[PDB]
Ligand binder design. Structure first.
Ligand SMILES: [Mg+2]
Lengths: 70, 29, 172
RNA sequence: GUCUCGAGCCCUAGACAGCCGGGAGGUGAGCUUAGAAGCAGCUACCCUCUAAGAAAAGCGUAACAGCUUACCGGCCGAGGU
């Protein structure tokens, strides 16, 4: 039902393509309040019990794309 | 006596109060 | 060394000299187990394979005698089953059991029938496209099963194109 | 091939091997690209669940699928390397 993680990051960023070299070349940006909205959406997709660990799975795709958190 | 086996027994004894060999060892305690 | 083998209830085994006879409901198997300083005896209801020597050569045979006796126990009870499937590409092969020998006719277009003799008490049953070799003596059954596959040997032409022949499907 | 002597390491908290079971999700990573989803190539190689389970070691596919490897559990039981 709920679309993939790679698509949900590109909507609230404004950028389409990633990078030639991840983590070494920073492209997009996010904030803490913006990751708390993506954590509410995926409930049957993630295996995490709490909302605390549900955010870590989204961050575990972000830093390996070129997204810096402020 | 491996260090990870000692840490595992202390993790099982923690979830009794609150491998089948490591469970038996933890129950005997 | 000494290895004691407990005899099953369905089985009863007698022994004289170097020969061991193992009887059961599926039949009887007599084998000769002869090697230097290895004594195989029947102690009531256990088979004892012992030797005063512990060298690699003696140890190899003690372990071989063990598996030979354990296999005889299985043979006289549940028996030994080898399943085979007859495959052909162009020429319709005619496999038939004619007496104490299994005959394969019209193999690869041959006018002359290919045949092999069945080893002892081994029974070969055929049900259309399938063949099932069975009996108490694994030595006899294993060989008769092998003999059938070896019978369609082709050394002259490519095996990958000319694949016709009965092949072993099930190993026990 | 076989005999003999030494050293290190692992083992009844169960070793070596075999067999059974599990080999999971985020996500078919991103870039490349019509596509590439462990496995053409470039870069990274991160965290959840958990007793394990690689951003995949080897095959396999046009690409999937499919088969096992790592890794965990079970059966077994004495030495093993
Ligand atoms: Mg030629």
């Amino acid at each position: 039902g709920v679309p993939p993680t790679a698509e949900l990051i590109k909507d609230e960023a404004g950028f389409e393509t990633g990078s030639g070299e991840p983590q070494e070349d920073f492209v997009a940006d996010l904030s803490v309040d913006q990751v708390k909205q993506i954590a509410e959406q995926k409930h049957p997709d993630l295996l995490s019990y709490d909302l605390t660990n549900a955010a870590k799975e989204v961050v575990g795709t972000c830093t390996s794309l070129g997204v810096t958190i402020e | 006596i491996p260090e990870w086996k000692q840490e595992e027994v202390d993790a099982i004894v923690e979830m009794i109060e609150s491998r089948n060999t490591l469970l038996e060892r933890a129950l005997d305690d | 060394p000494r290895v004691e083998l407990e005899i099953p209830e369905d089985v009863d085994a007698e022994q004289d000299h170097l020969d061991i006879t193992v009887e059961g409901d599926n039949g009887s198997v007599t084998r000769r187990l002869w090697y230097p300083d290895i004594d195989v005896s029947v102690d009531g209801d256990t088979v004892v394979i012992e030797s005063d020597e512990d060298n690699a050569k003696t140890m190899s045979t003690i372990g071989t005698f063990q598996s030979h006796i354990e296999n005889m126990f299985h043979g006289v009870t549940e028996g030994w089953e080898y399943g085979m499937e007859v495959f052909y590409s162009h020429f319709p092969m005619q496999v038939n059991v004619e007496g104490d020998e299994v005959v394969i006719e019209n193999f690869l277009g041959e006018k002359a029938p290919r045949r092999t003799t069945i080893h002892g008490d081994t029974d070969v049953e055929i049900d259309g496209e399938e063949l099932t070799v069975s009996g108490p003596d694994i030595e006899a059954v294993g060989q008769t099963a092998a003999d059938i596959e070896q019978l369609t040997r082709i050394n002259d032409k490519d095996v990958r194109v000319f694949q016709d022949g009965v092949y072993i499907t099930r190993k026990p």
